[PDB]
Structures are given as structure tokens and as C-alpha cells.
Amino acid sequence: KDDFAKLEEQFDAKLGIFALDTGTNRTVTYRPDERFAFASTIKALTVGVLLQQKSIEDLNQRITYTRDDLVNYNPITEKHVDTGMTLKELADASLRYSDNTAQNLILKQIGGPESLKKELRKIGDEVTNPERFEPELNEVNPGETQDTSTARALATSLQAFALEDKLPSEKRELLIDWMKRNTTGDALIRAGVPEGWEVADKTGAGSYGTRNDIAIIWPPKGDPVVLAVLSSRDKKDAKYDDKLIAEATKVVVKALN
Numbered sequence: 050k051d052d053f054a055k056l057e058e059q060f061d062a063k064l065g066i067f068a069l070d071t072g073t074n075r076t077v078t079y080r081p082d083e084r085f086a087f088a089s090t091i092k093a094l095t096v097g098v099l100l101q102q103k104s105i106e107d108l109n110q111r112i113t114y115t116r117d118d119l120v121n122y123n124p125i126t127e128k129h130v131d132t133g134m135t136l137k138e139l140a141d142a143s144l145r146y147s148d149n150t151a152q153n154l155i156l157k158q159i160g161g162p163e164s165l166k167k168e169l170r171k172i173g174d175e176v177t178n179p180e181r182f183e184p185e186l187n188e189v190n191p192g193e194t195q196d197t198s199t200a201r202a203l204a205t206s207l208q209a210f211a212l213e214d215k216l217p218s219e220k221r222e223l224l225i226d227w228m229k230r231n232t233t234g235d236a237l238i239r240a241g242v243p244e245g246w247e248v249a250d251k252t253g254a255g256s257y258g259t260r261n262d263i264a265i266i267w268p269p270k271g272d273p274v275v276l277a278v279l280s281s282r283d284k285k286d287a288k289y290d291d292k293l294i295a296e297a298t299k300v301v302v303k304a305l306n
């Protein structure tokens with residue numbers, strides 16, 4: 050646990066780590082049960098739940114929306130107000146670009162934050178606590194439990210949809226394929242794994258310099274590793290440093306080797 054403490058001192062941040070080798074049941078933990086704002090990592094679990102409810106052809110359904118439906122950061126969705134987008138394309142934009150309107154439209158389709166919460170409780174996640182849409186969910190103050198979870202619960206919930214029987218294999222593959230092709234995580238978990246390791250991740254960023262990455266990772270040979278790396282800082286307007294997540298990942302890899 051001293052390598053993580055030194056990282057917490059170097060980057061002046063609090064770290065939350067849970068890693069599991071699905072093949073050996075070896076874990077690496079550090080503040081595994083401390084709450085952090087989940088931020089955009091919730092996008093992964095939201096698509097997890099959508100996949101539970103929608104058939105593949107349901108995903109071809111066109112969703113119309115307006116300029117007023119758009120929020121702060123909509124890289125894909127703002128470009129398609131006139132024509133709408135299929136659920137499939139919204140999931141793609143939400144996961145790989147972290148498009149906030151895409152997320153919000155998907156969350157509405159599943160019934161809103163309380164419905165997402167209920168579905169997570171059903172799969173045994175008693176920790177994750179969604180209450181809000183994007184971008185307001187990204188802002189969580191100290192001591193608050195709204196829109197928070199833990200390294201352990203995020204990893205376990207991600208593990209549930211991507212690797213266990215919470216989704217049938219084809220839908221697992223679809224989720225994994227989107228997350229493999231994520232565009233926002235090059236400097237995080239991806240930067241901390243050895244050459245030839247495959248990564249499917251979702252990133253998050255929030256107030257208090259909160260910087261998260263959750264992933265399934267595959268060594269060259271062997272079973273996948275489930276990893277959540279969460280972080281926050283003590284000032285509301287703090288900047289995060291991606292190098293903290295990359296280095297923490299390197300510690301996880303070393304400890305698992």
C-alpha cells in the first residue's frame with residue numbers, strides 16, 4: 050500500500066483502487082470502499098442497463114431531439130439536431146466521446162436516474178447512487194453520496210455487464226467493442242499497461258479534480274482483469290493530472306505480476 054500513498058503525495062490527490070484478476074481471484078485494493086463522484090463512468094453502466102432492456106433491432110430506433118435538449122458538451126449530438134440519431138449511435142457517442150446529451154437521451158429511455166438505480170440494485174450494486182443527468186451529476190461536494198460510488202462497486206458493476214451473465218454474449222461483445230474503441234482514455238489506464246495488453250475503458254472527470262477510469266483489461270494470455278481507478282482532490286476548482294491514473298495502473302500491473 051506504500052506505492053499508492055507515495056502517488057497520493059506526488060499528485061496531491063486521494064486514490065481509490067479496485068482490481069481483480071478474474072482468473073486467480075487476486076485483488077489489489079486501496080481505499081476500495083471510499084466514495085468518489087463517478088462522473089462519466091456512469092455512461093458505461095447506463096449502456097449496460099440499456100442493453101438489458103433493448104433488443105439489437107430496438108437500437109435502430111431513431112430518437113429526435115432539439116437544440117434545447119442539448120447541454121454543455123455534445124461533440125456528436127449537436128451535429129445531428131435536424132436528423133436525430135439511432136439508439137445505437139447514441140450509445141456509441143456516449144461511450145467513446147462521452148457525449149452528455151447522448152447519455153441523457155439514453156437515461157430517459159431507461160426511465161431516468163431512479164430506474165438506473167433500481168436496475169443496479171437488482172444486480173447487487175447497493176452502493177452506486179445516480180440522481181442526476183449530465184453535466185450536473187459531475188459535481189459532488191465532500192460528504193455527499195448523490196451520484197457517487199466506490200472503486201469496488203464500479204468495477205463489480207462493470208464486471209457484471211461486460212463479463213458475467215447480466216448480458217448475453219452478443220450484447221457483452223457490443224459493449225466491450227465500444228469500450229475498446231474509446232477515444233478519451235489514451236493517457237489513463239491505457240498508458241499504464243504493458244505492450245500487447247488490450248483495454249476497454251470509460252473515463253470520467255468531475256469537480257474537485259475528480260479523474261476516473263474504469264476498465265476491463267486483457268493480458269496477452271490469461272483471463273481479464275477488472276480495474277477501477279478513482280481520484281479526487283481537496284479544492285473545488287482543482288485540475289487533475291492523467292499521469293496519476295497511468296502510474297497507479299502500473300502499480301496494479303506490478304502487484305498482479
Ligand SMILES: *C(=O)/C=C/N[C@@H](C(=O)O)[C@](C)(Cn1ccnn1)[SH](=O)=O
Pocket residue numbers: 088089090121122147149184187188252253254255256
Ligand atoms: C464526464 O465525466 C464528463 C465530464 N465533463 C467535464 C470534463 O471533461 O471535465 C466537463 C466538460 C467540465 N467539468 C469538469 C468538472 N466540472 N465540469 S462538464 O461536462 O462537467
